[PDB]
Every structure is written in C-alpha cells, then in structure tokens.
Design a protein around this ligand. Structure first.
Ligand SMILES: *[C@@H]1O[C@H](CO)[C@@H](O)[C@H](O)[C@H]1NC(C)=O
Ligand SMILES: *[C@@H]1O[C@H](CO)[C@@H](O)[C@H](O)[C@H]1NC(C)=O
Ligand SMILES: *[C@@H]1O[C@H](CO)[C@@H](O)[C@H](O)[C@H]1NC(C)=O
Ligand SMILES: *[C@@H]1O[C@H](CO)[C@@H](O)[C@H](O)[C@H]1NC(C)=O
Ligand SMILES: *[C@@H]1O[C@H](CO)[C@@H](O)[C@H](O)[C@H]1NC(C)=O
Ligand SMILES: *[C@@H]1O[C@H](CO)[C@@H](O)[C@H](O)[C@H]1NC(C)=O
Ligand SMILES: [Ca+2]
Ligand SMILES: [Ca+2]
Ligand SMILES: [Ca+2]
Ligand SMILES: [Ca+2]
Lengths: 486, 517
C-alpha cells in the first residue's frame, strides 16, 4: 500500500545573503539554524504525515544576492525557481529558499501546489522568522509542494475541522501560538495526492546525511552496516539482525520491504504495485532491503484510455480537473457543451482573453477552452472564485444539459477553469495555451529502441528517467534480447 | 532576724551564694546586695514584704530572664544597680512599680537588647548608666535613640558594637537615616483552582470586581469581594472558546466587556442594569482581526478608544473609536507584521510641556515601535523604533515623580528599564531574565515595584530605590507560569493577582510591617 510506506523528502535549502548576515556573518550558525528548522519540521512530518524530511545539501551565498528579490512571495518563488533551473545542478526532491527579508503578504511563504519532483515546480520560498515559526512556514510550503491544501468545501462547510481550539493547524493562519498538528483532512488530501500517482521521487531513502553519523537515528550512514528507527522500535524489524548498528554474519539486510527475517527477498518479487495507469510496478532487486526507486511511465503515455496523458506519474484529464477544482461530486460535461459554447464567444465560454476581449475558438480547439462541468457548487475547493459562476443550458433533441464553469484564482497568471497544459484535445493531440497541437510539437524525449517507430521495441515501458522497463521474456536497455525460454 | 546566708550589719545586708531571695529582712535594713548568688531567675513579683529598701544592687550573678513587675513592693527604693552580670533579655515592665527610682545602672552586664519603653513609668530618674554593653543596633536601639534624645536625665555615652557595619559608633549620634524599620512583603492570600492568563479590575458602585481569562476551557471569569468572611468569590462567568484577553470598560455608568479569541474572537458585551446578565452587542469581522494576542484600553480627549494586537501577519493592528451605540473601526497600524503586545503611555515630548499620548507595540522578530498622536488628523503620525534591542515581547510603563520610564520584556536576554528624555529612551538598568513573558511595574502607596516572571525559575520581584534611582532585588515569588501581574485595591486592602498558564493562579496579599514596634 502506498500510504503505509514511510517516504523521504530529499531537501536542499538555499540561504540568501540577508539570512547569512542575520546570524553572525557566519556559515556555521546559518547551517545549524537551518538544520534546526528542518529538524522541527521533520519532527512534525514524522508523526503526522508518515514522511521523513532529510536535507541532502545546503548552499548559502556570502558573496551577493544572485537575483532581484521582491516583497511579493510569488515573484520571489518564480525567480528562485529560475535560479535553480538555470544554475543549481544539485540532485534533490525539493529546493527551498530561506530569506532574511520580510515579505509583505498575508502568507509567510509561497510554494507551488503539487510541484514535488518537478524541476520548475519543485520547491518554495520561506521568509525569516524564529526557529519554530520558520519551521511552521517550511511545513506549510512543503505541504503545498506535497499536495496538501488549506481550504475546501468540506472545511468551509465545517465538515473538515481543526480540532485544536487553542492553537491553529499548519495550513491555517499562524498566530503567536504555533500549530503542532495537521487536520485529518490534510492527511487524506496527501493520500489522495499519492493515489493519483504524484510524488514518485519521494520513495528513495538517502544513505548519506551531510552531518556526522549517529547510531539508532533511523538512517544507515558511513561506519554502520545497518540501522533501524530507534533501539526501542528496532524490536519490530531489524532486531534479529542489527546489533550496535552492525550486522552479524547470517543477516544480509536489517529491515525493509525487501527484507524478511534478515534475508534478501528474491529478485523479481513485487514490493509496490502500480497505483494508476501512469505508474510502473517495481520489483525487489535482491541487492538492497529498500524497494527500488519509484518509477512511472514517461510523459506522453496514454492514461484513462485516450482521455489523458501522463505527467509526473499523474493522469491529467478534463473530468479529473472538474473533480479536482469543484469537488468529487462533479462530473465533466458532455462534449456538446464545449462545442456549442466555443462558437458563441460569450462570457459563458471562450478560448481566452488577450486584452479585455474574447477570442473566437478554432474548430479543433473546442476542448482546450473554458472548462465546463455539470453540477457545480457555490464555492471552489481551492482558491477563490473570480467574478461569478457560469451556467448555460443546452438542449439537444429534448435533452437538457446544464454546462457550468468558473474562473478560480491561485496566482495572478494561473487561472483554473482553463484546460490545463498537456491535456489531450484528441488522438495524438494536446492542449497548450488553449490551443490544440500535435504531440510532436512538445519535443518529448524517448528511450532506446531497436525496432524503429516503437518505444523500447514494443517490449517495454519507457520511464521518466528514459530507461526501459522490459516486459516478461525481454532483457537489455532496448529490451531487444530475448529470454532462454519463451 | 537576718538570714544565715547573708552578712548583715544594722542598716546593711550583704548576701553571697544565696539560692533564693529571702522575703524577711530586719525592719532597719536599708540597702541590700546580692553577689554571685545561685539564683536561676529573679522571683516573679519579688521583693515584697520588704518595703524599707532604698538601695538594691546585683553583681556577678547569672540571670536568663528578669520577670515583669519583679521590683513591685518597693515604694522607697531609690538607687538600683544591676551590673557586672550575664543577662540575655529582660521584660519591659520589670522596672514598673517604682516611681521613686533615681539612679539606675544596667551597665556592664553585656545586654545586647532592651525592650521598647523599658524606662516608662519612672519620672524621677536622674542618672542612668548603660555603659560597657555590646549593643546590636536596630529598631530597638532606634527607640533607645529616641529616649536618649528626649530624656532630661544625664546618660553617659554608649556605643554600637553591632552590626559590624556600625562599630564603636555613638548611640547618641544616630539619626533616622540608615534605618528602615518599615518593610513590605507579599504573602499569598488565596489559591485558585484554575489556570489564568490575563487579569484586570474595574469599579462599580463602590464594589470592586476582577476579570480573569482562562484560555483552555474558554472561561472569562468575573469575581467580586464577598465582604462577609470571604477573601474572594466568583459571581459570574462568560463562556467563549479560546478566550485570550478580557478587558472591561466602563463608559458613563455602563459596563462593557471585550473578549478576544482565536475563532470568532472579536466580540463586545454589555451588562443589563437588571439581573446582572452580560449580553453580546457587537461582533467585529473575523477576516480583519485574526489571533489577537493583546488588548489595551485608553481614552484620549473626551473620546474612548480601543486597541487590539494582531499576532498573525494577515491581520493588522486596529484602533476603534466609540460612538454612542458601539465600537467601530478608527485606524490600522503595522501592516504585515506579527504584533505580540501593545501599550499606551502618555509622555512629555519636547519642546512641548504638555503630555502627548503615544502607543508602543512590539513585534516578534522586530524592534518595538512608538507612535506620536496627531490631534489635527486624529491619527498617529510619527513612527519610530527604539534602537539597540530586539525580540521584545512586551513593553509596560510607569511614572516616578515627573519622569516616565518603561519596562521592556525579553524572553531570554536582558530585560531593561529605560528613561524617557526629550527625544528618545535612555538606558537605565539591564536586568537578565530567563523565560520571562511579562515585565510588570506596579505602584502601591508610593511604592513602585517591578515583577519579572519566569516559567523556569523563581519569579524575581524588584523594588524601587529613590536614592539609587534603580530597581533593586526585593522578593522571590514561585509561579508555575506567569503571564501577568495585576494590582487590586479593596478598601484599605491591597492584593496582587498572578496568573499561571501551566498551573493554578495565585493571589498574594500586600502587608506592610514595622519592626520598630
Ligand atoms: C546488484 O548487485 C549485484 C551484485 O551484488 C550486481 O550484479 C547487480 O548488477 C546489482 N544491480 C544493479 C546494479 O542494478
Ligand atoms: C443546473 O445547475 C444546478 C446547480 O445546482 C443543478 O441543480 C441543475 O440540475 C442544473 N440543470 C438544470 C437546472 O437544468
Ligand atoms: C526541441 O529541442 C530544442 C533544443 O533544445 C528546444 O529548444 C525546443 O524547445 C524543443 N521543443 C520544440 C522545438 O518544440
Ligand atoms: C523631660 O523629659 C520628659 C519625658 O517625657 C519630657 O516630657 C519633658 O519635656 C522633658 N523636659 C525638658 C526637655 O525640658
Ligand atoms: C465559573 O467557572 C468555574 C470553572 O469551572 C466554576 O468553578 C464556577 O462554578 C463557574 N461559575 C458559575 C457557574 O457561576
Ligand atoms: C517625529 O520624530 C521626530 C524626531 O526625528 C520628532 O521631532 C517629531 O516630533 C515626531 N513627530 C512627527 C514628525 O510628527
Ligand atoms: Ca528522490
Ligand atoms: Ca545510523
Ligand atoms: Ca512505480
Ligand atoms: Ca499590554
């Protein structure tokens, strides 16, 4: 089960010059401080989300500020991710900025929703504060990256509730009294994010801390051949094997999904099944006790039939977008709604705005335009509604269909209710900039192949790392070579 | 007719090594003496049946105590010499009963003390000799200084042998200076079952009431002085979940109460003239005010205002003017800051001789900031931060004579008091505190204290020294977690309330003691 595994967030923190100055013009003080923040946030996540946060790297600039900082946290987020993309080569699951400057915002920080494992979307920005306060800020930023949202129809309606009356909850507004705990609805939102295929990169357990090793901390570090969570909790798994952070002769592995009673499980045994059409199931290698690094299908593969195309292991469709924005009770409208509404060029449907004007949709762009759903509530699940709701009644041969939509705002330039980029408008077609384009225009990468015009020679699935996972009876990087017996 | 233990001529008797005082003397005996007798103590009401003695002397004896009225029955006694003995303490009324005593010598017995007004009741005294005693000089010897100055009788000089600070100093040469016999203390009158956060008091119809905010169960507690055989009793409650600060306000003989909470915290009440029931009037918008950590009440120029501290960055500080019907928004301060505390203080800003109202609010990561009131625009214009201190949780204020000083609170660091000059605040005293959520100045009957609490170690109370012009360590109070200190004045009664966040709150009684009596 994807929920029961204990996941790992590889984290890189970047301290700007103002933070470096804020402690003693000092590298050791900034390092220890940031490490403490990550320590407290990790204490929150360990208990609450069943996820550990490990910092594999840190970079602080003593020389000068690299880019132009803004009082707006969103602008600072965009520019910081520009710096990570154009400069930082370090491998990590997320990269977050610790800024000594004070933003003017309602929010103490900003992070891209569901942007984990992404290069461009993969991190956030957190302003300066005290140790615990900045720990909370990092907690909610990483919460955004991991798929957790503060607001919802369940929460606005009172179905979802923070049960601490004295102190808030992490996703809520932070006062002087700092929240120690997530609402259960945030937990279930995380589980929903994982069950949709997102956050595959989080299943790798770092074997190297940047800090000197310690025994009994829950991680295997240089000088120790085994470790468990605590010597007290070691009795559940690893007790028969690990002693004083060292294995006796008969124990191959301490603990893990591939470890049963101090012995490697055979290669090919399946530790984790695929959670959706975009996910590839993984098998134990017979080398390591931990299940192999999580892999999913390469971008461009079809999911939910021809109705979607995989991105980051997650299936992007229009119906899933309606259910995501407006809640689970919502269903996607029939194509007649979009087809009728794109031609009129009214407020009720359109392909976009240039300046204060509606563009008439092209005939093939019908499905790339204003997003239409049928049963819509009064309030959006996330963000806030701009303008009012849109309801258009369409009658075909006596059938009445109510086509409803709305403009939902997260960031000024990002508007829900427009078809998301990468959503297919048809066979071998996808929506970009509210226009229907062929797949070849996206310049997708590919794996190695022997037979031309095929992916992994048709015998395998191409991963997001551009490595072939072969089907039965096939071996090799191109999956060309056959097996001894059919 | 003379005892065998004594050597007695016709008019004289000399007794050595006597176990007990004989009550039978010859009629013609005038003077009587006791040398090295085996007496334990003087007999109580002794020396009766022998009125004829004009003289009594004791030398080289051992006496633990000399009982009251020991010399009664000696109307003709004139000279009395008790000297060259070892005596610890004698009773005050011992010498009472002789109005005929002229010469009295206590000298050389090494008395370290005398009781107040030991010499009262003899108006006939002429010579008295205290010499040759080691006298520890304190309030008893203060009354002795009074008597030395006020007596017509000639008294040879005596000296302080203690405390070592005063040695070989004339007891005749001492003045009221460098004697404080008037000391103050705080002893807890009452313990309360509930944990507390904020406390404030108000006066209605000569009855005094106190408002306590209990954060966890969300109870805003109103208690009154019971006045029959009870220190304190709580006559009412107001139930609000996550209650933080309860500040009462009375405008034109009408009681209003503001409560603040985390959710739907903004509220304002009123108490109905009949049935003594509080009724909610207004609810301020939840959107603008979120997670207030403080409330302060101030009135400026015939207008009541109201102020709240917003600890969240989303909400802004808000001052509320009051028209006839209710409170409504006036001004907003410190956008996008986390505000821990707010304080209102009226100070003299030069060149002006008038007192200008000011506001001091403290942030989490930011230095405190001061606002100057502007009468023309009905706003606060000047915005200035007090330099060279950071992480100030709260700032309070007090005034000693014409000067105005402030106490700035720091959780871990140096909490310091500063003097207000013409322009800015000037450093006075740096007092380290560990885990202090409050620094409270308090003025009780021309005594300015300061209370600095600790969630870790003992709460350190300080007292003001007028000559030193600097707070001095005074008393230690034990509180599990103190978030406040409040001064409560009943009629001719003074109490202080100490909240406890992690434990039961304390009620201390203020007692003034005089050691000179
Ligand atoms: C696992 O280890 C074995 C030897 O212990 C090696 O042959 C095999 O290539 C390893 N698997 C990898 C590197 O994926
Ligand atoms: C239109 O939308 C409303 C939203 O509540 C829904 O109840 C209704 O069934 C829809 N269709 C109509 C009114 O034909
Ligand atoms: C194809 O690759 C080029 C080379 O880097 C790149 O610039 C371009 O954005 C890619 N996509 C296209 C041409 O659609
Ligand atoms: C003498 O001493 C007595 C003591 O009570 C005092 O009342 C009186 O005024 C004195 N007379 C003087 C100082 O002349
Ligand atoms: C107010 O609340 C306290 C705390 O539970 C309680 O002891 C007291 O009886 C209450 N006063 C009432 C109900 O009048
Ligand atoms: C502002 O601060 C200055 C000191 O720099 C002071 O002179 C003035 O009275 C204050 N009030 C203002 C400027 O309104
Ligand atoms: Ca990873
Ligand atoms: Ca270890
Ligand atoms: Ca997988
Ligand atoms: Ca205050």
């Amino acid at each position: 089960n994807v929920e029961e595994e204990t996941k790992y967030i590889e984290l890189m923190i970047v301290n700007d010059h103002l933070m470096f100055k804020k402690h003693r013009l000092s590298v050791v003080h900034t390092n220890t401080y940031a490490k403490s923040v990550v320590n407290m946030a990790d204490l929150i996540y360990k208990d609450q989300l069943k996820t550990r946060i490990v910092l594999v790297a840190m970079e602080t600039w003593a020389t000068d500020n690299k880019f132009a900082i803004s009082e707006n946290p969103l602008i600072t987020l965009r520019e910081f991710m520009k710096y990570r993309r154009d400069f930082i080569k370090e491998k990590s699951d997320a990269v977050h900025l610790f800024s000594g400057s004070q933003f003017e915002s309602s929010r103490s920080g900003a992070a891209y929703i569901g942007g984990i494992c992404s290069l461009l979307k993969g991190g956030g920005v957190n302003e300066f504060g005290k140790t615990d306060l900045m720990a909370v800020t990092l907690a909610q930023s990483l919460a955004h990256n991991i798929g957790i949202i503060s607001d919802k129809r369940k929460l606005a309606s009172g179905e979802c509730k923070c049960e601490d009356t004295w102190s808030g909850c992490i996703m809520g507004d932070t006062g002087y009294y700092l929240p120690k705990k997530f609402t259960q609805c945030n937990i279930e939102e995380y589980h929903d994010f994982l069950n949709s295929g997102g956050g595959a990169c989080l299943f790798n357990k770092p074997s190297k801390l940047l800090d000197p090793p310690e025994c009994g901390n829950g991680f295997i570090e240089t000088g120790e051949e085994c470790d468990c969570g605590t010597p007290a909790e070691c009795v559940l798994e690893g007790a028969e094997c690990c002693k004083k952070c060292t294995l006796t002769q008969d124990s191959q592995c301490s603990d893990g999904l591939c470890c049963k009673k101090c012995k490697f499980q055979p290669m090919g045994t399946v530790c984790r099944e695929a959670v959706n059409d975009c996910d590839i199931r993984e098998t134990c290698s017979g080398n390591s006790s931990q299940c192999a690094p999580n892999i999913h299908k390469m971008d461009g593969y079809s999911c939910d039939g021809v109705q979607g195309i995989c991105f980051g292991g997650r299936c992007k469709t229009r119906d899933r977008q309606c259910k995501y924005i407006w809640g689970q009770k919502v269903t996607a409208s029939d194509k007649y709604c979009y087809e009728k509404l794109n031609i009129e060029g009214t407020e009720k449907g359109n392909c976009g705005k240039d300046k204060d004007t509606w563009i008439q949709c092209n005939k093939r762009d019908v499905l790339c335009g204003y997003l239409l759903c049928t049963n819509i509530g009064n309030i959006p699940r996330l963000g806030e509604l701009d303008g009012e709701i849109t309801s258009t009644l369409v009658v075909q041969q006596g059938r009445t269909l109510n086509c409803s939509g709305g403009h939902v705002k997260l960031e000024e330039d990002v508007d829900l209710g427009y078809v998301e980029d990468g959503t297919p408008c048809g066979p071998q077609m996808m929506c970009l900039e509210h226009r229907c384009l062929p797949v070849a225009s996206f310049n997708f990468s590919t794996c190695l192949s022997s037979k031309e015009g095929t992916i992994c020679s048709g015998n395998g699935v191409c991963s997001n790392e551009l490595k072939c996972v072969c089907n039965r009876h096939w071996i090799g990087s191109d999956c060309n070579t056959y097996f001894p017996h059919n | 007719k003379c005892p065998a233990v004594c050597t007695c001529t016709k008019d004289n008797a000399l007794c050595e090594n006597a176990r007990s005082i004989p009550r039978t003397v010859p009629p013609d005996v005038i003077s009587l003496s006791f040398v090295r007798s085996g007496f334990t103590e003087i007999s109580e009401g002794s020396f009766l049946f022998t009125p004829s003695l004009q003289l009594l002397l004791f030398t080289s004896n051992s006496f633990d105590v000399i009982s009251d009225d020991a010399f009664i029955g000696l109307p003709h006694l004139e000279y009395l010499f008790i000297e060259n003995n070892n005596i610890k303490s004698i009773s005050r009324h011992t010498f009472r009963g002789l109005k005929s005593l002229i010469h009295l010598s206590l000298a050389n017995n090494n008395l370290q003390t005398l009781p107040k007004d030991i010499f009262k009741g003899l108006d006939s005294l002429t010579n008295v000799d205290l010499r040759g005693n080691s006298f520890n000089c304190d309030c008893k010897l203060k009354w002795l200084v009074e008597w030395l100055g006020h007596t017509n009788a000639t008294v040879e000089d005596i000296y302080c042998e203690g405390p070592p600070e005063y040695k070989k100093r004339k007891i005749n040469s001492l003045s009221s200076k460098d004697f404080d016999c008037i000391i103050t203390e705080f002893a807890k009158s009452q313990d309360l079952p509930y944990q507390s956060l904020s406390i404030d008091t108000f006066s209605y119809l000569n009855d005094e009431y106190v408002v306590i905010a209990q954060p966890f169960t969300g109870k805003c507690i109103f208690l009154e002085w019971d006045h029959v055989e009870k220190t304190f009793r709580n006559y009412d409650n107001i139930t609000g979940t996550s209650t933080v600060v309860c500040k009462p306000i009375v405008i034109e003989t009408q009681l209003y109460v503001i409560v603040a909470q985390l959710f739907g915290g903004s509220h304002i009440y009123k108490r109905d003239s009949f049935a003594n029931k509080f009724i909610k009037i207004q609810d301020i918008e939840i959107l603008k005010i979120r997670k207030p950590n403080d409330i302060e009440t101030f009135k400026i120029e015939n207008n009541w205002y109201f102020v709240v501290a917003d600890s969240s960055k989303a909400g802004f500080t808000t001052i509320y003017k009051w028209n006839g019907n209710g409170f409504y928004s006036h001004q907003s301060l410190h956008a996008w800051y986390r505000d821990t505390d707010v304080e209102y203080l009226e100070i003299v800003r030069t060149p002006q001789t008038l007192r200008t109202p000011h506001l001091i609010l403290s942030s989490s990561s930011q230095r405190p900031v001061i606002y100057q009131w502007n009468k023309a625009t009905q706003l606060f214009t000047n915005q200035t931060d007090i330099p060279n201190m950071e992480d100030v949780y709260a700032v309070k204020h007090f005034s000693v004579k014409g000067d105005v000083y402030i106490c700035l609170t720091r959780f871990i660091g140096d909490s310091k008091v500063m003097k207000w000059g013409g322009s800015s605040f000037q450093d006075i005293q740096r007092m380290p505190s560990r885990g202090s959520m409050v620094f409270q100045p308090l003025q009780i009957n021309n005594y300015q204290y300061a209370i600095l609490g600790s969630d870790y170690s003992f709460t350190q109370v300080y007292n003001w020294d007028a000559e030193k012009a600097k707070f001095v360590k005074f008393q230690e109070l034990n509180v599990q977690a103190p978030r406040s200190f409040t001064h409560v004045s009943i009629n001719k009664r003074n109490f202080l309330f100490a909240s406890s966040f992690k434990g039961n709150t304390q009620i201390y009684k203020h007692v003034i003691v005089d050691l000179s009596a």
